[PDB]
Amino acid sequence: PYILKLIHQVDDQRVGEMEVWALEGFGVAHILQEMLTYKSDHIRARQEVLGTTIIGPEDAPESFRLLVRELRSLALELNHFLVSEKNFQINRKEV
Amino acid sequence: DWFPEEPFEAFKEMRERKVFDVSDMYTIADVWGWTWEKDFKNK
Amino acid sequence: MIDRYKHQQLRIGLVSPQQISAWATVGEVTKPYTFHYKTNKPEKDGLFCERIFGPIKDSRIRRYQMGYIKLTCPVTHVWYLKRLPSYIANLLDKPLKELEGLVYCDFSFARPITKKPTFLRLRGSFEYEIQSWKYSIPLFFTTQGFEIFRNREISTGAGAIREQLADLDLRIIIENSLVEWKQLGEEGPTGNEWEDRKIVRRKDFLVRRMELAKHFIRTNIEPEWMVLCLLPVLPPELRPIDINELYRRVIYRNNTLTDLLTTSRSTPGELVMCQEKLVQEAVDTLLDNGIRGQPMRDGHNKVYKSFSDVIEGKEGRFRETLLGKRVDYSGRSVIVVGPSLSLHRCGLPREIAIELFQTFVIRGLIRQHLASNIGVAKSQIREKKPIVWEILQEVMQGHPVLLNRAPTLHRLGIQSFQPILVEGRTICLHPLVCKGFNADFDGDQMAVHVPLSLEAQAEARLLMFSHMNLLSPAIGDPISVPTQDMLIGLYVLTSGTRRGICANRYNPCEPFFCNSYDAIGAYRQKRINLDSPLWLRWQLDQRVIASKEVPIEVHYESFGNYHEIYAHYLIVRSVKKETLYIYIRTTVGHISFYREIEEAIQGFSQACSYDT
Amino acid sequence: IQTERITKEIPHLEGRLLRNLDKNGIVMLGSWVETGDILVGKLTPTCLKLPIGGRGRVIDVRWVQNPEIIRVYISQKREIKVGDKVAGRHGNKGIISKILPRQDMPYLQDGRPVDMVFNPLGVPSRMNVGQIFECSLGLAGSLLDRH
Amino acid sequence: DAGYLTRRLVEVVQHIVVRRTDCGTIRGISVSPRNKSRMMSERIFIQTL
Amino acid sequence: MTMDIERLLLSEDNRFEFVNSVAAEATEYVEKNRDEYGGTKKAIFHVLSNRVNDLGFDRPEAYAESDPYKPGPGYLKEYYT
Amino acid sequence: TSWICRLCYGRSPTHGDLVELGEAVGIIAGQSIGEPGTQLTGG
Amino acid sequence: LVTFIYEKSQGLPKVEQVLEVRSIDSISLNLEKRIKGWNRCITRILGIPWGFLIGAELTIVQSRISLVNKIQKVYRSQGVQIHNRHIEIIVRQITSKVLVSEEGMSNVFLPGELIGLLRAERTGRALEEAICYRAVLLGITRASLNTQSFISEASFQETARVLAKAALRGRIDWLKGLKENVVLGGVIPAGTGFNKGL
Amino acid sequence: EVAYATFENMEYGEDFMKPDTETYNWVIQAYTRADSYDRVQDVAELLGMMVEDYKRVQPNVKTHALLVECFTKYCVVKEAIRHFRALKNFEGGTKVLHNAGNFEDPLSLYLRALCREGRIVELIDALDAM
Amino acid sequence: SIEIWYATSEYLRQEMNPNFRMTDPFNPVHMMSFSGARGNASQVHQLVG
């Protein structure tokens, strides 16, 4: 037969929203967090994540912080509080 | 599959199908012994 | 059992003008400017001013710190005015048409404030300007004294709404709405569908109104905040050089309104309103542009993307940015069939593996003193020393990776495999798992992610591996069932002897093997074919699955031995003894298939020798 | 690259990259180049390195010059390999997963080993029997020396 | 169409998680095998139980 | 190890608690001995090998295996894909 | 309606035993119905 | 020349029609006949604390068995085997809320309010302040927009409308769901993230 | 929500963790003495659980004290009267509802609510209890 | 025209498997579909019917 060679290897990432559903189905909460953290647009954590794995969170991701500003621009105040389970001490997580 | 069209017959279907029965038919007054509540409304 | 309590409240609400100022604390913006055309510098007090939004080049604060705009006249928030049903209309009980004309059709409203004394017979919204209100009343009370109580009697624009909202007695609103709602249901049916249609709308309006009022007094949200006097500004990083021209549009429109008020005795009315309705429109299109009756368009007739749009659609920063990320440690390349791979393994190319395990390889070089520091290791990796590949080979050993199909299909669209360094520049994949991924081999590219944290590596190995996910949760059926030529090969094996007229030319009117090993060995020596019938001396119990039928023929010898010929096996019993000899009529293919399963079980048991 | 001065060599660099740069700063016409080697040495008040995958021999270089424009052409002798896409004219697409020596490929009764092995399962599902006709007729045409 | 339906289906039950051992309910859906076989197969009736 | 992983889960009550316990113990191991779990020995595999050995069975430490037939230091085993 | 207990749900199809606490059983149900989406005369 | 007229004699769209519950008769064309007769008969045969209690339950229970049968009818016809659990979970959310009638007004439940069936059943068991509720079937799109979290509703659709309504009320979200913790990057309260890992 | 979360952990738990009369009082008290959004619906549902669990839990003096406190505060008086009538059957009676005049004394509110609602006949009955 | 050709087509599909089973059980096209490895009766019917 006559067989051609194609161009794909000559001419020539993002995790979608569905992969989140699959990860939640497995219940891999730490893996799911890892996708939306320093292995993403997260400057503070990614700055030292190289060096922790070279030698051997607690902050909202930049995406959430960016989301707050957009809602903050629409005269909407999005506040994240952590009411303590020990002494009921309410503290506002800065975003 | 399909409950009876007649509401009275539908009540019969619930009791045999354990959907609802008289044992589940109670209010706050009788379970808490509010005997005085009887003579305060239907007057 | 005490649950590990974790209470995390995430409240949202309207923001007071003071808290808007608190965000900018001073962040006042007055110049509708940006980076200079020539000097490439941010103008002072501009949309990119360094003083307002922090240093340009720490510099990370520009993503967070934001400024505000001081509007001379209040502006209604279009989310609560033109998004039907209007919360302002519900709260003020006035129909939306009256509110629209009060802020867009230069109408006037009577008695905006009730908490202060008033001396006028005027009642409500006046679509016509009062003749005596412009030259007679101001002259009588003098201009200086007239403006003191001017807004107390007649107010125009969003200022009328804001003062009216402030003046609202929320307790009273609940009381009179309830009795009005009670009164409407007292009459009952009216006999007319149209009248009954409207009585339902009014009753639901009253219920919605009092529900809105009951929420206001139980929270710290003031209804005046629906009409903002300060406009927050997005941080410059989030708006690099579309919405910038909107911000410069409201700023310069508002600034020129100041020039129409700060000047000595400007012309009121036709000029004051002109750049007071426009400033309302500028804030309107800035917040929400799709709800406008005449949405604003650019010179190229492009519909402006409002802040509502930047959080509504998929391109908005709500779904795409949050539900999914441009995850690092990702490598996309063509995949090929690794038929020799194990079910839980995947082959990674050297150039893809080194990219994913960049940090871990550097750690190995530093740990074993091959590289003094990070800089030496990175240069050494680029040098591609033979030691680097040896370090990479041991680094990937025991470190699972996640393989993801970008057009994801199932829960198996993302799964974890143990990577092994393989030759070539393509990702070898197990044939069975390529069905869980629907990985056709006419072209496919997978995204691979390497877990970093020890917790992530733990759950990747212990929850997502293919050896623990064999049943589909839909019904509980296996997913890694052999298919394609795997199923063909097994079918040929178990497709046994030709039977009946397909085996003998004429009506009749075979080797015996003491054990399965001889039958397999004879097949290897080409002595018998795969489908050629044979008799296997069966040492176990009766185990073959055949249709339950009486023997075809029983050869009962006179000495007590009787042979029972079944459809698929021969059983030799005796009366004197209890020998119970069984011979199975089968093929090498059935023996090979049975032996393969039995050997797999024994091989797995011996490897996992818990006995020792 | 569209232009800032093109230099023969940039400081704080070694001969691992600047080996092929010429007097102006362009590569030698006919010099082999690997990934990461500098092609045009520019200095702005900015360079041109060969990206990953790009490799081979430099064939042509253009000086245009008014900012100057430098265009450099590299020829790659891209032979077939694992992961390339091959397809017939009947929609029978295929990725290459294995490359075997000629002595272990299946061979005909004249001793010639086959060049490519296809999955027969593709035909019944995809229902393209034209390749079956073309395959057999191609063998006849080559033996009879016909087209 | 199926992909669009997946997003709506997962959203309505994205919050449902097994969080308690036994909720303590007493009411149970009653099923009888004699009034059911007249419509559906008996094999699928097994899967329901 | 795959059989051993399941064997541990047989005596477990919740597989999500098991992985959390394994991850917690693996983090404890690496903190004590930073320069041990980087190459041929993995922190998580060492935990799994220990947990099997705690049951009374025998496994190699961290399931690590060498290549007795490796000819030279520069020779790395090419995988026949 | 915001969660479900182990007994009320039942036995997990994947593991062949009673479901374990913390399983995202709602998302599993959503995918179990959406996945067969791409699978759905003589008279 | 002449024109004859002759008479000649459902997949994913059928399921979406059933799931979205755009019209009550759109799923079976017979459920409306049952409930409409039940609506104007049960509420008058029985008293105030039980006219709506079991009357709504009859609508809920009958809809539950009807909805699962119609959904399973599509998949079983196409040779698709799905356990009832994965469908009953979807139906449970759909047939969960109950709508209070316009007659019932009080400081507890105002008319035109959406509450859960368990909420109404428990409140009606104790209170007598005119708790008049009728069972309501919700589509998956509509039900997902009426939950205990605006973040999930906002990220789903109608983001401008959901946020605007929540902002006035000062809505508190306890992020007890899964999608809520995804957007803010927190560990989801499921799987390995259930409780706090202890 | 902090108190309710603990209640859920024990409501949907083992037999020895099942709530008793004292437990229901604390959960209701948390919702009644709330400095936040409306909680009358939650109290009614929480009360709905207690009446459903009648075979195990029976109300006490503190139970009706909070319900009268809750209903009078949320202006629902007809249900407040019902629990006050049951409250009168206890010897402690209004003194428990008084709470030493603390928490913006609910005992005065019940008297004041009846006066404004015009339910004078019930008002004279309340004075008899005092 | 529609019915006589549909009945003929269905009869050919109906008789396809028994013909393969009774005459050419080891036919390569038959074994690929009958074993369930690849393809179904409808696709084979497009080739041989």
Coordinates of N, CA and C in Angstrom, one line a residue, chain E:
Chain E
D1 N -23.3 17.9 24.4 CA -24.5 17.9 25.2 C -24.2 17.1 26.5
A2 N -23.5 16.0 26.4 CA -23.2 15.2 27.6 C -22.3 15.9 28.5
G3 N -21.2 16.5 27.9 CA -20.3 17.3 28.7 C -20.9 18.4 29.4
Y4 N -21.9 19.1 28.8 CA -22.6 20.2 29.5 C -23.5 19.6 30.6
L5 N -24.0 18.4 30.4 CA -24.9 17.8 31.4 C -24.0 17.3 32.6
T6 N -22.8 16.9 32.4 CA -21.9 16.5 33.5 C -21.7 17.6 34.5
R7 N -21.5 18.9 34.0 CA -21.2 20.0 34.9 C -22.4 20.3 35.7
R8 N -23.6 20.3 35.2 CA -24.8 20.5 36.0 C -25.1 19.4 36.9
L9 N -24.8 18.1 36.5 CA -25.0 17.0 37.4 C -24.1 17.0 38.6
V10 N -22.8 17.3 38.4 CA -21.8 17.3 39.5 C -22.1 18.4 40.4
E11 N -22.6 19.6 39.9 CA -22.7 20.8 40.7 C -23.8 20.6 41.8
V12 N -24.9 19.9 41.4 CA -26.0 19.8 42.3 C -25.7 18.9 43.5
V13 N -24.7 18.0 43.4 CA -24.3 17.1 44.4 C -22.8 17.2 44.7
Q14 N -22.2 18.3 44.4 CA -20.8 18.4 44.7 C -20.5 18.4 46.2
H15 N -21.5 18.8 47.0 CA -21.3 18.9 48.4 C -21.6 17.6 49.2
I16 N -22.2 16.6 48.5 CA -22.6 15.4 49.2 C -21.4 14.6 49.5
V17 N -21.1 14.4 50.8 CA -19.9 13.6 51.2 C -20.4 12.7 52.4
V18 N -19.9 11.5 52.4 CA -20.2 10.6 53.5 C -19.5 11.1 54.8
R19 N -20.3 11.7 55.7 CA -19.7 12.3 56.9 C -20.1 11.7 58.2
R20 N -21.1 10.8 58.2 CA -21.6 10.2 59.4 C -21.6 8.7 59.2
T21 N -21.5 7.9 60.3 CA -21.6 6.5 60.2 C -23.1 6.0 60.0
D22 N -23.9 6.4 61.0 CA -25.4 6.1 61.0 C -26.1 7.3 61.4
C23 N -27.0 7.8 60.5 CA -27.8 9.0 60.8 C -28.9 8.7 61.8
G24 N -29.2 7.4 62.1 CA -30.2 7.1 63.0 C -31.6 7.1 62.5
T25 N -31.8 7.1 61.2 CA -33.1 7.1 60.6 C -33.8 5.7 60.9
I26 N -35.1 5.7 60.8 CA -35.9 4.5 61.1 C -36.7 4.2 59.8
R27 N -37.0 5.2 59.1 CA -37.8 5.0 57.9 C -37.0 4.4 56.8
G28 N -37.5 3.4 56.1 CA -36.8 2.8 55.0 C -37.8 2.6 53.8
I29 N -37.2 2.7 52.6 CA -38.0 2.5 51.4 C -38.3 1.0 51.3
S30 N -39.6 0.7 51.2 CA -40.1 -0.7 51.1 C -40.2 -1.1 49.7
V31 N -39.6 -2.3 49.4 CA -39.6 -2.9 48.0 C -40.2 -4.3 48.1
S32 N -41.0 -4.7 47.2 CA -41.6 -6.0 47.2 C -41.3 -6.6 45.8
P33 N -40.9 -7.9 45.8 CA -40.6 -8.6 44.6 C -41.8 -9.2 43.8
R34 N -43.0 -9.1 44.4 CA -44.2 -9.7 43.7 C -45.0 -8.7 42.9
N35 N -45.0 -7.4 43.3 CA -45.7 -6.4 42.5 C -44.8 -5.7 41.5
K36 N -43.5 -6.1 41.4 CA -42.6 -5.4 40.5 C -42.3 -6.2 39.2
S37 N -42.3 -7.5 39.3 CA -41.8 -8.3 38.1 C -42.7 -8.2 36.9
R38 N -43.9 -7.6 37.1 CA -44.9 -7.4 36.0 C -44.4 -6.4 35.0
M39 N -43.4 -5.6 35.4 CA -43.0 -4.5 34.5 C -41.5 -4.7 34.1
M40 N -40.6 -4.8 35.1 CA -39.2 -4.9 34.8 C -38.6 -6.2 35.0
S41 N -37.4 -6.5 34.5 CA -36.7 -7.7 34.6 C -36.4 -8.0 36.1
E42 N -36.3 -9.3 36.4 CA -35.9 -9.7 37.7 C -34.4 -9.5 37.9
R43 N -33.6 -9.6 36.9 CA -32.1 -9.5 37.0 C -31.8 -8.1 37.5
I44 N -32.3 -7.0 36.9 CA -32.1 -5.7 37.4 C -32.6 -5.4 38.8
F45 N -33.7 -6.1 39.1 CA -34.2 -6.0 40.5 C -33.2 -6.5 41.5
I46 N -32.4 -7.4 41.2 CA -31.3 -7.8 42.1 C -30.3 -6.7 42.3
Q47 N -29.9 -6.0 41.2 CA -29.0 -4.9 41.3 C -29.5 -3.8 42.2
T48 N -30.8 -3.6 42.2 CA -31.4 -2.5 43.1 C -31.2 -2.9 44.6
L49 N -31.1 -4.2 44.9 CA -31.0 -4.6 46.2 C -29.6 -5.1 46.6

